[PDB]
Amino acid sequence: LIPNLYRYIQPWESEFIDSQRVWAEYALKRQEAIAQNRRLTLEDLEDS
């Protein structure tokens, strides 16, 4: 069966809750970087 586009786009609900969670992670990963005195990098944010 040809794959349909229907199964390859995340629902808006999951996207919004994941946006909240991921931006919380980024905020926690940036305020710490202020204290540790380094710029962020692709390595940290690849998981997000």
């Binding site: 229907y6 199964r7 390859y8 995340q10 629902p11």
Partner: peptide, 22 residues
């Protein structure tokens, strides 16, 4: 067998949008 596209109405019993797309 035919190339005509079949409407997936009634074909969504066991599928989700986010499945097979992680």
């Amino acid at each position: 067998p035919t190339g005509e596209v079949l409407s997936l109405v009634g074909k969504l019993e066991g599928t989700r949008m986010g499945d097979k797309a992680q």
